[PDB]
Amino acid sequence: HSSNNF
Amino acid sequence: HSSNNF
Amino acid sequence: HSSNNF
Amino acid sequence: HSSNNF
Numbered sequence: 001h002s003s004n005n006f
Numbered sequence: 007h008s009s010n011n012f
Numbered sequence: 013h014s015s016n017n018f
Numbered sequence: 019h020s021s022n023n024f
Contacts (some may be wrong), residue, residue, distance in 0.1 A: 001007045001008065002007045002009075003008070003009045003011075004008075004010045004011065005011045006011065006012045007014065008015075009014070009015045009017075010014075010016045010017065010018045011013045012017065012018045013019045013020065014019075014021075015020070015021045015023075016020075016021065016022045016023065017023045018023065018024045
């Protein structure tokens with residue numbers, strides 16, 4: 001799984 | 007699964 | 013599954 | 019499944 005927070 | 011938050 | 017939040 | 023929120 002991958003999470004990306006900007 | 008992948009999540010992307012901008 | 014994939015989620016995209018702008 | 020995929021979700022897209024603009």
